[PDB]
Amino acid sequence: NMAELDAMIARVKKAQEEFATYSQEQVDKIFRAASLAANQARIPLAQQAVEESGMGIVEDKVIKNHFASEFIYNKYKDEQTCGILEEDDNLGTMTIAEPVGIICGIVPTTNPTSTAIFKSLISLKTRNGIIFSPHPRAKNSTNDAAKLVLDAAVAAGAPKDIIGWIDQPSVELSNALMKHDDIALILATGMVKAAYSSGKPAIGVAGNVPVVIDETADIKRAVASVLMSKTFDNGVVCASEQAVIVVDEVYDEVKERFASHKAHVLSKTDADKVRKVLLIALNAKIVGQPATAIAEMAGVKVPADTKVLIGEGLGKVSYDDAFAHEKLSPTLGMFRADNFEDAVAQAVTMVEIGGIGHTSGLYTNQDVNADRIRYFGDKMKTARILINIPTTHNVGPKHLINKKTVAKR
Amino acid sequence: PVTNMAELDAMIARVKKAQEEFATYSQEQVDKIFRAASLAANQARIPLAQQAVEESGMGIVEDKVIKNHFASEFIYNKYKDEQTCGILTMTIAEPVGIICGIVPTTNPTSTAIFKSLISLKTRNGIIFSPHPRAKNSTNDAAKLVLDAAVAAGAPKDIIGWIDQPSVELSNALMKHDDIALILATGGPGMVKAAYSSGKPAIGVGNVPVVIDETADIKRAVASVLMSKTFDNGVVCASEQAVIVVDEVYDEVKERFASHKAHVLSKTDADKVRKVLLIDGALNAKIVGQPATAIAEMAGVKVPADTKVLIGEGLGKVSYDDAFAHEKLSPTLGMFRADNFEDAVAQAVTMVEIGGIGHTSGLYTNQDVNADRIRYFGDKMKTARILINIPTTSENVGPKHLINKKTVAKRA
Ligand SMILES: [Cl-]
Ligand SMILES: [Cl-]
Structure with a gap:
């Protein structure tokens, strides 16, 4: 609901602020721990996703989950996302990284768990907070995907509320999360249109x-x-x-x-x-x-x-x-x-x-x-x-x- | 003559066709248009500065002269040799289509110069939506660039503009099916309006x-x-x-x-x-x-x-x-x-x-x-x-x- 949305957002804001100050070593430990746990849950989550949504194929959704976890882990294990990315001491310049803050992730009925794992792991790697706006039709698949990754994250040292979600999704709450002042980015995967019409930096993820x-x-x-x-x-x-x-x-x-x-x-x-x-x-x-x-x-x-x-x-x-x-x-x-x-x-x-x-x-x-x-x-x-x-291909x-x-x- | 909806739509269609023709142009042809239009814009340095101060009632003529210079000659020297057409598995650069330039009263001539030049350099069409307090110097800077691009061989309707700017038309131009991109400069409001347009938008802080x-x-x-x-x-x-x-x-x-x-x-x-x-x-x-x-x-x-x-x-x-x-x-x-x-x-x-x-x-x-x-x-x-x-x-x-x-x- 409208009220409790705000309280959840302000939680992840502060949780992100704590997360921002973390060392690359603690970021790496959380990233691996969150990714290894998502991979080890490839099957249960795929199974859950098929049954809730009532579509797709377990064995293929298992493959999707393995890609969103272990494959993302192996691609970005060593990518620098924090601190000084470049220096030129002659020019007296440097480029410094800055987490964007809180991400708003829109998750579709079509890939409920793999997209949640993916966005969660890449938010964690970049010291961001992320809040999921699931589709009614697969609310539990994605939120339990988010939760599994959260809990593995919290256990390797991550702040309590570094990821959240809207538990009971609505058009009111989706639009509340999007146009909110302390949400900095929309990751949106029609629904694309809503993201670009919100005044926010948005990345839209289908097409014909x-x-x-x-x-x-x-x-x-x-x-x-x-x-x-x-x-x-x-x-x-x-x-x-x-x-x-x-x-x-x-x-x-x-x-x-x-x-x-x-x-x-x-x-x-x-x-x-x-x-x-x-x-x-x-x-x-x-x-x-x-x-x-x-x-x-x-x-x-x-x-x-x-x-x-x-x-x-x-x-x-x-x-x-x-x-x-x-x-x-x-x-x-x-x-x-x-x-x-x-x-x-x-x-x-x-x-x-x-x-x-x-x-x-x-x-x-x-x-x-x-x-x-x-x-x-x-x-x-x-x-x-x-x-x-x-x-x-x-x-x-x-x-x-x-x-x-x-x-x- | 663009003072209303059927006229905006009608003008948009002419730029649509212009850009269609312009898309086909060679890098040599583009270069020639780009040099010719930048040189003309620079040469109008002073009269466009004077016009700007007179109409909007703000700023300093010889400081705007320098703005018009940097939007013209400097922009030319920066990008004289930049590739924008053709080949870059392979990568092909392509024009975005028709741009919507939102131009504020603060820099009515230099931003219309700049925007027109880099639009021409890229084989796009661009249509400006000026602010009413500076609409003449904006549209005339646009016209001057247009006329010199056209005389150097650029298609006729390649640059357009709303003669009598208003909310309904500004909103409509940004929202129009045939606009690929919004280049929006000016106020916090407008910039945000470009971000809420549901179109790709670039905005130009305290x-x-x-x-x-x-x-x-x-x-x-x-x-x-x-x-x-x-x-x-x-x-x-x-x-x-x-x-x-x-x-x-x-x-x-x-x-x-x-x-x-x-x-x-x-x-x-x-x-x-x-x-x-x-x-x-x-x-x-x-x-x-x-x-x-x-x-x-x-x-x-x-x-x-x-x-x-x-x-x-x-x-x-x-x-x-x-x-x-x-x-x-x-x-x-x-x-x-x-x-x-x-x-x-x-x-x-x-x-x-x-x-x-x-x-x-x-x-x-x-x-x-x-x-x-x-x-x-x-x-x-x-x-x-x-x-x-x-x-x-x-x-x-x-x-x-x-x-x-x-x-x-x-x-
Ligand atoms: Cl899935
Ligand atoms: Cl100016």
Whole structure:
């Protein structure tokens, strides 16, 4: 509630102030102890996450947790985040680190535990406080993830309230935490929009990813490549390919190949029963569900061993086509293109859905289409451009400190 | 002619197309536009300065001449050779799109120059939203840069502006689908409005100085005043108050009369406060006015030759004392500290009052007091920290006006 939010915030403020003065050695001891404990809990937390949210796959969520813990630990074990980062005694200058203070972490339904572990460990490493604003749908997964890391932290010497959370999440409390004066940064992983509209320094962490397969591509490789992501944690991953935009001459060959990967191409009529279930705004009930259960939410009989649903668009890429949108599930759109340039044009449109200009992909004969690649590179407004490569082929400590420069006469 | 919504939208579309064409330009073509437009802007150094002072009613013509110079020639020499287009697996620089420049009355011509130049250098389009008290000199500095870019071959609508600025349109420009970035300078309000726009936004603080007992007082006093009269103290990140340790307080205060800095009586100080802030905000009518004029509007008598007003705090730095605020004028608060740590503590509040901490300074004996320097370093939540040096993130540049894109190939 509104009142007890303030009291919890002022606790972590003072706890951060105590934390700020710590030695790198105590920071390191806490970091390792918090990370080793999160890793050792990879399975229990993954299991808890699956059951509460009611989506995804334990074994894949176990992998997610191991990455957010041991992998983060090994990347930043030796990264300097405190004190003098640079000196030049001749110029009489130096750069000094400064923790940002208190972080506000927005955690989604989609990766409740791994994102909490990740943000917790990188806050601890940088002498920050962090407060989690979980999604109702996975409140306990993330807060118990936060708690496990807290308790391991407190036991290696960390201040009592260096991490907290909103126990019962609301729109009032999320907005209270965000616009609060002593919260310095938003780490936000639509909900992106709220963070950027709050007056705060914000880092937003998804986006719509199109894939163009042109006439010169290796069809068998492109098709397997594009499919790699869709089944991992039931397609719950941020950078992933949402639709295939295929040049006419190679269209049918792409469509036929899907079937040897257990990707079921939905008839026109069965695609419309899925398309009415994907969107209403993305429907939370399909998010991170297997292809077979999404089909059974729709009207659609699909073979038992199917891993992915393919819904092909009549007409071009259109806002009205839900298969043209980000689906967070084992689903892909498939859209027909007159030629390479047309497919590029259709990709541009998918990118505009999302506002987020994240990543795009092209499958083509590299050896002979250098012009096309450069063309593709000049026309995609996405930070990452992938050629013949899937998205499964970056917030860090450095973002949660301030560099202060000191100049002496 | 942009005085309303259908006209703003219509103008935005013309810049959209201009930027589309400009995106295609070569680095050579860009260089030529960049040189030509910077040279023209510099050549209009004086007439644009004069226009600025006349219209906004503030500042010093020949100080704004220097501002217009540094926004033009200096910006040119800094970035003549900087790569902004093309190749940098591979990295491709690309223009952000259309920029929204928010231009304040304090620097109406130099910021429109600067912003236009680095926008041109990056193949972006830019549309300015001036403040109504300086709208002509802002839009005409814009026009002059535009005309010279166009004559050097830049697309027609590449720079735009709102002819009759208003809240609804300013808000609309920032919120418009087709604006990629907001470059917002000026007031705490506007800057924060750019941060709440839900768009990528760059904003262009209240600067405390501590003078402890170990300092060189002659030097500290002199250095602290250097910024104060430049364009009547409209100077980004110049000193706003001295916080002085009690042991050397009368010494510092005594040296102020030597430098044309009049120390206000407790009574006069009170009169000046009420004129400094109005409705909690910096009073527009004192900004960029000389010390004597600010004395006149407060109804306070001051020698004809005085350059800076000094208002002494009664007690410690506090939100309630207008001299603890950013004043954008030749005026300085002066506050008493019991000792060095108490000084640092009052400086901390001044950084809080300013909002975002940006710069702070300490004068000490740096060849004895290393512990104090480090101590001041730790407590000061400011990007820049200066020891024994006047103020006289980093700077906004082309770097900020492009998105970098990585292409990854498959072996
Ligand atoms: Cl997870
Ligand atoms: Cl100016």
